């Protein structure tokens, strides 16, 4: 089963970057490395056993992180079907989702207790102190700010994002997407050391085509400690990123 397969890759202590959480980067792709169908089309990539595997992986992480455009497109719950607590983290630099905050599934789950209180990562000063206090009371959310010196030409440093999560006592985070975040984290290094600890990819037996949402890093990326698993329809590769 996928349980012994994943055992070397689930979060642990042997980390080269103690200031950061253990980071798992994990997603499901078509054969042509798309992670969503073309606009207006339905996305079917991962089948039931690897969906079970993804929920199992969530049961091993303190937090789950996705980008604002994933929330807008998918309205994900960001909890764990096994029932273990996982903290939802949404990267939303200008807090686009504020105008939608009352209707999001992840907000409803936080209020009902079926999920944990969400955290939104924004630029400094997007939400005033007073408004942060009201949003915490009314919608059960917290705001974490990235310092101006950690944003260059509009892009937040992943080192800075992960350090702030670790300081919020998040010891492990499962980063699921979307493609912008995946492409960036595949190449992110701190003195040649990757910020991602484990890469876990489900490959579904489908082509989504040239107009789907593409994953491909800006340069070639080598993998180490590679192990494969497969079920009936899907395969899974797990690896580290090479130095």
Residues preceding chain discontinuities in the chain with C to N over 2.5 Å: none
Question: With CB under 8 A as the contact rule, which of the stretches 37-45, 50-58, 61-69, 74-82 interacts with a copy of itself?
Answer: 37-45
Between CA 21 and CA 63 the distance in angstroms is 10
Q: Is the peptide bond before 107 cis (omega within 30 degrees of 0)?
A: no
Applying CB under 6 A, among 56, 177, 208, 241 the residue interacting with ligand NAP is: 177
For a copy of itself, the closer CB: 19 or 211: 211
Contacts of 59 (CB under 8 A, 6+ apart): 80, 82, 84, 86
Give backbone dihedrals phi and psi of 27, rounded to 5 degrees, phi first. -155, 170
Burial class (CB in 10 A: 0-12, 13-18, 19+), 14: exposed
Give backbone dihedrals phi and psi of 96, rounded to 5 degrees, phi first. -50, -40
Applying CB under 8 A, among 80, 162, 208, 213 the residue interacting with a copy of itself is: 208
Q: How far is the CB of 14 from ligand NAP (least distance, A)?
A: 26
Q: How far is the CB of 4 from a copy of itself (least distance, A)?
A: 15
- Per CB under 6 A, 156 contacts ligand NAP: yes
For ligand NAP, the closer CB: 22 or 27: 27
54 binds, among a copy of itself, ligand NAP, none (CB under 5 to 8 A by kind): none
- Per CB under 6 A, 28 contacts ligand NAP: yes
What residue has token string 């040649």?
A: 192
Q: Which of residues 192-211 bind ligand NAP (CB under 6 A)?
A: none
Interface residues with ligand NAP (CB under 6 A) are 27-28, 35-36, 45, 66-70, 73-74, 91, 93-94, 96, 155-156, 176-181, 184, 213
């Amino acid at each position: 089963s996928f349980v012994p397969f994943l055992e070397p890759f689930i979060p642990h202590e042997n980390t080269l970057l103690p200031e950061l959480p253990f980071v798992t980067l994990t997603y499901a792709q078509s054969l042509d490395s798309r992670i969503a169908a073309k606009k207006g089309e339905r996305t079917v990539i991962s089948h039931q056993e690897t969906k079970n595997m993804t929920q199992y992986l969530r049961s091993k992480h303190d937090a789950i992180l996705v980008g604002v455009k994933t929330v807008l497109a998918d309205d994900p719950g960001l909890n764990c079907k096994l029932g273990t607590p996982i903290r939802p983290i949404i990267l939303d630099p200008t807090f686009q989702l504020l105008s939608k905050i009352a209707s999001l599934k992840l907000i409803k789950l936080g209020l009902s207790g079926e999920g944990e209180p969400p955290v939104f990562i924004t630029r400094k000063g997007v939400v005033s102190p007073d408004l942060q206090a009201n949003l915490r009371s009314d919608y059960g959310i917290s705001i974490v700010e990235i310092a101006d010196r950690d944003v260059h030409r509009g892009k937040m440093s992943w080192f800075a994002i992960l350090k702030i999560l670790k300081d919020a006592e998040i010891h492990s985070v499962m980063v699921e997407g979307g493609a912008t975040i995946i492409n960036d984290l595949l190449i992110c290094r701190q003195n040649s050391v990757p910020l991602v600890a484990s890469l876990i990819i489900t490959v579904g037996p489908v082509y989504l085509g040239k107009d789907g949402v593409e994953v491909t890093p800006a340069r070639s990326v080598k993998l180490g400690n590679v192990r494969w698993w497969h079920g009936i329809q899907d395969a899974v590769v797990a690896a580290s990123l090479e130095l």
